[PDB]
Design a protein around this ligand. Structure first.
Ligand SMILES: CCCCCCCCO[C@@H]1O[C@H](CO)[C@@H](O)[C@H](O)[C@H]1O
Lengths: 274, 276
DNA sequence: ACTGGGAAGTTCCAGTGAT
DNA sequence: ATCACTGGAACTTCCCAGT
């Protein structure tokens, strides 16, 4: 067995799935170590083979059994919702720089699933009896299906390998959590300071403000009514563990989504004596 | 139009749905305000009509679209999973004393749904296409379908009205929270005292230990790994608001479920001064 | 049966940057 | 300059909860 290794996973959060109405292609999935400057792409290594062959990339469901997803991969060398291209004969490391995710509408689900079946796009060969019930339209995995050749030219299908899931950034409960701005980043160790926090879209029933430091955690105090049009929160700081401070102590403040335990990048908060 | 109002909702929690194999009544859904010395039952009022009429009561899903549920109502005047009988023509208020819920097995789900369709038990006329979503078999709603007569004296089906959800008491995500036994009920105002708490079944990813007083709240500290087989939690007390207590302070301690903000009954905990 | 209102799902659009 | 692409805004559907 030669086999396929993912050397660069896709970035999980931050990219929108795009509708067909928004255009032919849907951009390019970044690798998880992409940045403003040096941007990267999902990448695989084929161990134990070099030479001609085929790579197919398809979308499957986040959870097992990994059914073909109703959404589509679009971009260079994509057709019928999947990517397919000749493997580069020379190298054993392969990057995919033009993969976009095009989301199907909810009313077009049954048709999309019909197309997956008709195009033999079912990497795990899931029985049709299982392709009926609920799909998570906010998450997908890439499935890499590489075919290489034996010494006589016979195709050999390597075991399919799944990426980490990719989450729709436009969707209510799977978006990147991001603190955009706060009115202040320090306050008293007694707590009770009012913070106005501007954020990317949140759901008021599935959001908290989580303060953390060495062996300490607490929560900002607010009600659902204090979440203003999903993009601002007014809350009160918690008391720090120690209500009488020698000197300033720095802690982290982040948005937390309790449903999936996801966190924003931390913002520094400084607790002050008195 | 006359219309139906629910004046006594079914009690949401406390009933175990029974399987056919258990071969018993399946019991009687009590009303929301029922108490031992004052039994009450699910009750409706018809506004704008006294006179002959019939009612059908069926089970539908908790969430829209309100599809017929695979489970069955069983009891007097129930057949094919629904209740149907006359309403008293001399009165506007009607109660139902013997409604029970029989749960269908997962392997029998498709047969049960076929039965709902075959017996025209689809109160919201949901297309068969949309009856393909997964079902929550631990929650149902009652659906009351009253047929009256118009002023001319022909059959008139009123708009169906849904109850609050009824939950199977087997499901921990919707169960009553209960503290059964705790090994200590006081500790230092500095926090950090280890407590063993035995409780009714919880889910380890969706439980907290919540300490409160006037204008104060804090949580016990523990990981998922500290919840033992859904029925025990080993946690450390949070510090009290005031680390310089000069005498004991009583606070409340309770289990809390973050998902629906449900609380157990409170217990008394005393924080104590710490000398050493 | 309607009635006020928040937000999920879908579409449109203004600016625009790094090969 | 282009022009797919980015992220903000607008449009359309759904749903809850009250008289
Ligand atoms: C003087 C008020 C008379 C009643 C107002 C018009 C008829 C009732 O109007 C509405 O009908 C609904 C039924 O669909 C009820 O649930 C509401 O509570 C009621 O206000």
């Amino acid at each position: 067995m030669p086999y396929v290794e993912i050397i660069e996973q896709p970035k999980q959060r931050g990219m929108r799935f795009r509708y067909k109405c928004e255009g032919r292609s849907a951009g390019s999935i970044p690798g998880e170590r992409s940045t403003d400057t040096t941007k990267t792409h999902p990448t695989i290594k084929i161990n134990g083979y070099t030479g001609p062959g085929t790579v197919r990339i398809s979308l499957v469901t986040k959870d097992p059994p990994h059914r073909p997803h109703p959404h589509e991969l679009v971009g260079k060398d994509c057709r019928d919702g999947y990517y397919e291209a000749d493997l580069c004969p020379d190298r054993s490391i392969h990057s995919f720089q033009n993969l976009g995710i095009q989301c199907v509408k909810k009313r077009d689900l049954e048709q999309a699933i019909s197309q997956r079946i008709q195009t033999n796009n079912n990497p795990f060969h899931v029985p049709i009896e299982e392709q009926r019930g609920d799909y998570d339209l906010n998450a997908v995995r890439l499935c890499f299906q590489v075919t290489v050749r034996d010494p006589a030219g016979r195709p050999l299908l390597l075991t399919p390998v799944l990426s980490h899931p990719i989450f729709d950034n436009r969707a209510p409960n799977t978006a990147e959590l991001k603190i955009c701005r706060v009115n202040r980043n320090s306050g008293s160790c007694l707590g009770g300071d009012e913070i106005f926090l501007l954020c990317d879209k949140v759901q008021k029933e599935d959001i908290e403000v989580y303060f953390t430091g060495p062996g300490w955690e607490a929560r900002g105090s607010f009600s659902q009514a204090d979440v203003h049009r999903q993009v601002a929160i007014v809350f009160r700081t918690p008391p720090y563990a120690d209500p009488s401070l020698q000197a300033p102590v720095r802690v982290s403040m982040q948005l937390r989504r309790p449903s999936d335990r996801e966190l924003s990048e931390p913002m520094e908060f400084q607790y002050l004596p008195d």
